[PDB]
């Protein structure tokens, strides 16, 4: 599948449902589809062809969502560049990814590197169509590397039934689109019929979260750092959410327990996974009313994914034994752009699935007796 | 040391039906669906073989 294919199902089912809320600008599903189609036509007319990489340098906004979908409709892959990156980093990402064009705004126009065609988004509809085996994006992740992710992997993530996002949900969007969390913030609600609520400029703090919840936001992801801070300082600020999500850096069980005792009814979801396997490969969900206990698991593989904990001989270890964690099944990136050797040493053959690959996380983990995973630190 | 990082190890290059390449420690049984196409050889030698011969990441299918 592709995220555009899943999105088209929602546009057909409820074209006049709200898709994107940006301050006072509101886009319905049909309006978003039509705007992206027009921008796709512009991209095709400027010479974008299937498989091209198009850099994006924009502030979060409805125009950002339109732009990403338009690049996809043109058959191309987006290269997300955060407007706050230094110019040498931006130049590297554009050149290493092979992007010859960059979509920007009046405000960001000055950040387009020399020799790169600037497409100012504020300036006929035609679409080539996204395909599952084509690249969807290149996300950079201490030398920067480009992770090349196909449409099929993005759709496996965004359309996963475990997200449990419904048409009435409103998801707060504030993560950098350069980052993986953006996939949940933007594509999960849109393939589910819900809406994306673009956060006001600046970092989301406890007060802004409370205001977003009062305005109708039902789900929000916070980085581990921001979640720990709010959990310890103002855990009642999560009240009214259907679900809060967090992951990345370490989240201590104590932080989750603080939220549960302040907010008995909020679902708390811990996410784990690298950019190489599309946002998250395992997760742990704390249901309303349940208490976390002394350790926060990284949890169980998402539906459609698999995890293995192997020893130095590549044999599966028994529960309670720490070994090397490998991630497989759905959601793997194609590899590292322009770096086949590096790809071949980290996306390796999977002994448990014929012809398949598994991603070597470089993390250590152990299983519990009933099949959850506990983090046991990075191997280095 | 993780066996895929052992610079003193002996290694193979494997390919699957999609043309994707994998390094592989020569001591380990080759998984179903993968064929050895190079080695046993040094880790660096195997990386060179992959860089030369795996031109396009996309699965051949």
Numbering used by the authors:
A (entry chain A): 9 to 131, 136 to 153, 158 to 396
B (entry chain D): 2 to 62
Please share excerpts from the published article on this structure.
In this work, we have sought to understand the evolutionary history of lipid II targeting glycopeptide antibiotics (GPAs), a vital class of nonribosomal peptides used in the clinic for the treatment of resistant bacterial infections and exemplified by vancomycin (Van) and teicoplanin (Tei). Since ANC1-3 domains display polydisperse elution profiles in size exclusion chromatography, we instead turned to the characterisation of an Acore construct of the Hpg accepting A1 domain from Tei biosynthesis (A1tei), which possesses a homologous pocket to ANC1. The MbtH-like domain Tcp13 also exhibits the anticipated fold, containing a 3-stranded antiparallel β-sheet and an α-helix adjoining the centre of the sheet.
A365 of A1tei is sandwiched between two (W25 and W35) of the three tryptophan residues found in Tcp13. These tryptophan residues, strictly conserved in MbtH-like proteins, are crucial for complex formation, and are located at the end of the second β-strand (W25), in the subsequent loop (W35), and in the C-terminal region behind the first α-helix (W54). The expressed domains were all active, displaying kcat values between 0.08–0.89 min–130, which are comparable to the Tei A1 domain (A1tei).
